[PDB]
């Protein structure tokens, strides 16, 4: 399908953009309990693997995961 070919370009872009915030977030979670840093690290692996596969579903899952953890780190830090 011809939007399928567009969608793929879309999550890949959106996922890379989130991947690029992972150091910033690892720094912030340096102080916190290792769960935070570990979750970032594990979601980072999945994201990269999905970018490589170029599989739309894997990419979309990883994007949600990273957003979730980033959001959780935002919340801790904001106390």
* Domain positions in the chain: 1-79
Q: Which CATH number fits domain 1-79: 1.10.357.10, 2.60.40.10, 2.60.40.420, 1.20.1270.10?
A: 1.20.1270.10
| 55 secondary structure, DSSP code | -
Which structure tokens are listed for 51? 């970018």
Residues whose CB falls within 8 Å of the CB of residue 39, separated by 6 or more in sequence, listed in order = 69
Instruction: Say which experimental method was used.
Output: X-ray
For this entry, resolution in Å reads: 2.5
Do the Cβ atoms of 50 and 61 come closer than 8 Å? yes
- Give the dihedral sign, CA 64/67/69/75: negative
CA–CA dist 9, 34 (Å, integer): 33
CA–CA dist 40, 44 (Å, integer): 6
């Amino acid at each position: 399908l011809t939007e399928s070919q567009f969608h793929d370009k879309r999550i890949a872009e959106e996922l890379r953009t989130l991947l690029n915030k992972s150091n910033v977030y690892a720094l912030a979670a340096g102080s916190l309990n290792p769960y935070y840093k570990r979750t970032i690290m594990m979601n980072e692996y999945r994201a990269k693997a999905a970018l490589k596969k170029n599989d739309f579903v894997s990419m979309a899952d990883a994007k949600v995961a990273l957003e979730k953890i980033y959001k959780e780190i935002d919340e801790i830090i904001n106390r």
